[PDB]
Amino acid sequence: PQITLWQRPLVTIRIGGQLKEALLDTGADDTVLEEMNLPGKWKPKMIGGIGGFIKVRQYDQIPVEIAGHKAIGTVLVGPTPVNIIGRNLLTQIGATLNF
Amino acid sequence: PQITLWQRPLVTIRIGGQLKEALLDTGADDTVLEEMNLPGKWKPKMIGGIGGFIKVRQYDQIPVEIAGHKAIGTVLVGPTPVNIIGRNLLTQIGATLNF
Amino acid sequence: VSQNXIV
Numbered sequence: 001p002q003i004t005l006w007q008r009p010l011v012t013i014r015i016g017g018q019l020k021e022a023l024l025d026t027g028a029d030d031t032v033l034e035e036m037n038l039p040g041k042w043k044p045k046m047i048g049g050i051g052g053f054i055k056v057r058q059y060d061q062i063p064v065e066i067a068g069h070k071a072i073g074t075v076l077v078g079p080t081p082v083n084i085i086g087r088n089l090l091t092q093i094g095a096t097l098n099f
Numbered sequence: 100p101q102i103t104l105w106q107r108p109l110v111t112i113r114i115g116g117q118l119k120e121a122l123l124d125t126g127a128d129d130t131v132l133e134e135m136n137l138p139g140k141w142k143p144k145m146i147g148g149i150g151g152f153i154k155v156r157q158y159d160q161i162p163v164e165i166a167g168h169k170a171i172g173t174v175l176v177g178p179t180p181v182n183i184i185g186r187n188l189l190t191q192i193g194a195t196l197n198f
Numbered sequence: 199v200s201q202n203x204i205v
Contacts, residue, residue: 002197005190009125024196025126026108027183027203032149047200050131050179051150069198081148081205084126087104097102097123099168099194107203127204149202185204 001067013083014065015075020083022066026097028086031064032076038062045076054078069093100166112184113164114174119182121165125196127185130163131155131175146175153178168192 003009009024016039022031030047042057056078063072064085071089102108108123117135129146141156155177162171165184170191 002195005125005186005194008128008186009196023126025124025203026104026196027122027124027126027181029107029200029202032202045200047149047202048180049147049149049151049202050153050204051147054149066198078149084202086202087107091104093198095104095196095198097100097104097108097125097194098197099100099165099192122203124203129204131204146204148205180201181203183204 011067011085013067013085016063022083022085024090024095025084025086026090026095028084029088030074030076030086031089032056032078032080032084032086034077034080034083036077038075038077042077047076047078064089066093110166110184112166112182114161121182121184123189123194124183124185125189125194127183127189128187129175129185130172130183130188131177131179131185132182133176133179135176137161137174137176141176144175146177155179163188165192
């Protein structure tokens with residue numbers, strides 16, 4: 001897909017029989033989801049944003065379908081403004097910034 | 100270009116003879132450059148995301164160069180850990196995301 | 199030590 005920047009790059013994500021709207025944030029190292037229950041043992045992490053640090057709970061190896069392209073990886077659940085797909089899953093699916 | 104996400108999308112910008120480094124942020128609404136003494140009128144504003152909000156000063160019509168591509172726009176100065184090129188200007192140099 | 203970018 002060629003997706004322009006005139007509006008936030010929001011695409012639908014299929015995350016284990018759950019559908020969500022997430023944001024393709026190439027400024028994000030990781031993929032941070034809004035509070036959610038995922039199958040698995042999590043470990044607590046602390047990541048940062050412009051506002052400071054947040055404590056997050058992380059899940060390793062978890063498949064995600066970014067608009068019908070499959071990624072498999074870390075996905076942190078936490079208190080974010082929105083769902084962001086970061087460069088973790090973003091490079092699995094081969095996204096590039098062109099200009 | 101065609102930037103790759105293996106590594107963050109750091110590039111170089113020109114702002115009033117400041118040659119500088121920036122993160123192309125498809126996930127940034129606005130453009131927030133750290134501390135710099137621009138010439139002019141501004142008006143405080145608030146932005147946040149992971150972390151919370153932080154106050155920044157907003158400058159109108161400022162000229163900038165994103166890797167040999169001119170663009171002029173709103174630019175926020177404030178306590179950011181990475182100069183970030185948000186979509187506002189992002190949309191002026193023809194950036195797309197492709198997968 | 200992981201950073202994440204603005205609303």
